[PDB]
């Protein structure tokens, strides 16, 4: 429903992110919605004029000097763009966090 592209220093020259941006541009042209792509800028060292072109037209979101207000404006832009949602629950987040990020960092049951 919404596309989020990170316009990082290394996120504007890799082939994969540019190809994903190209197919995102194609599907946003098919869907005829300009709010499909929401760019994300996180590095101050990358100037505004050095980004790839699909980030030039859209105003890239603010995530550089702080993250809390950036997440807040992303959230309120989302709910003002009327994205369907579920009630908040961190239990799914907790389950995912225990699922992926604790796959090689846990004690095992072996004899030592």
């Amino acid at each position: 429903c919404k596309f989020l592209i990170v316009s990082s220093t290394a996120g504007n020259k890799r082939e994969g992110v540019l190809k994903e941006l190209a197919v995102a541009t194609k599907v946003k042209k098919h869907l005829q919605d300009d709010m499909f792509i929401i760019p994300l800028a996180i590095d101050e060292n990358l100037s505004y004029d050095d980004i790839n072109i699909e980030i030039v037209r859209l105003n890239a979101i603010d995530f550089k000097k702080s993250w809390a207000k950036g997440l807040q404006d992303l959230l309120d832009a989302f709910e003002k763009q009327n994205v369907p949602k579920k009630p908040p629950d961190h239990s799914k987040s907790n389950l995912l966090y225990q699922q992926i990020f604790l796959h090689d960092k846990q004690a095992i049951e072996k004899e030592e």
Binding site: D34, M35, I38, R57, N59, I61, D62, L74, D76, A77
Partner: protein, 57 residues
């Protein structure tokens, strides 16, 4: 149907007065468009600027 109120300013060198004026006119009962409030970040600007200028301002 053109009733929008357009405010142009040097972002962000005059953000405070623009914000206060936009809030005061939108609470007074005037549909006021400004770059800070309605043009939130993550939105294309210049096409929307043109459409508001030539359509609703």
């Amino acid at each position: 149907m053109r009733n929008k109120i357009f405010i142009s300013h040097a972002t962000p060198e005059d953000d405070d007065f623009t914000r206060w004026l936009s809030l005061k006119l939108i609470g007074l009962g005037y549909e006021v468009w400004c770059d800070i409030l309605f043009l939130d970040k993550g939105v294309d600007f210049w096409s929307t600027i043109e459409k508001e200028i030539r359509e609703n301002t």
